[model samples]
Target: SWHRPDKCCLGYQKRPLPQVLLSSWYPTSQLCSKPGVIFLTKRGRQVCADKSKDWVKKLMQQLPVTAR
Candidate 1:
């Protein structure tokens, strides 16, 4: 009874609800102020510009020496 749509969404909602809901149910949609973006976790995907080392460097520059 596998609904094939290349993604888990339509399959999970098709005909009947998914018997097993495996998700954190957490709200990670909030944007980070400094990082300011979402970086894809997939190995081959590129990191978001706002979440890059450059962004960290900018934040680090603003931090006190004791915090570094």
Candidate 2:
């Protein structure tokens, strides 16, 4: 039920989606415009979110050390 994306986010979502629908997420390249997170939903939807938002950061509440 998990997978990785193979591209950089050219843009980002203004806010977070339902965390319950989020299955996986990861940081984009630090070399890419300050970078951010790409959230994958259960439906395989890829979401680009700014790492700066608490809403986005909370999605990783359990994976505090999973950041790359």
Candidate 3:
């Protein structure tokens, strides 16, 4: 199972996690929106979030995109 910590409760900023399809991954510091799920191939390259496993798709669908 995967586990994401509550950043704020742990003292990081409370941020809005967004729904995204990361066909590729750059540095997280290069962008601001937190990804709800990430899919990777055998080579560790990113894949479309929508095409990820069913659990990930369901998790993404449950979260409403708050803003750009």
TM-score winner: 2
* Better candidate number, 1 or 3, judged by TM-score: 3
What tens-digit string does per-residue lDDT give for candidate 3 at 1-68?
67643311112212332335222322222133443334333364443332234554554455442221
Question: Whose lDDT is higher: candidate 1's or candidate 3's?
Answer: 3
Q: Model 3 clash pairs? A: none
Root-mean-square deviation per candidate = 17.8, 6.1, 13.6
Worst 10 residues of 3 by lDDT: 7-16
| The candidate that achieves the highest lDDT relative to the unseen native structure | 2
User: Candidate 1 — what's its lDDT?
Assistant: 0.26
**TM-score for each candidate, following the candidate numbering:** 0.20, 0.73, 0.23
Stretch of 10 with least lDDT, candidate 1: 7-16
Model 3, stretches more than 4 Å misplaced?
1-51
Q: How does model 1 score by TM-score?
A: 0.20
Model 3 scores a TM of 0.23
Residues 1-68, candidate 2, lDDT per residue (tens digit)? 57655567778898568877878888877767657788877797878888888888888674322333
**Model 1 per-residue lDDT tens digits across residues 1-68:** 89533211111111211213221111112432332322222242312223234543343343322210
How many clashes show up per model? 0, 0, 0
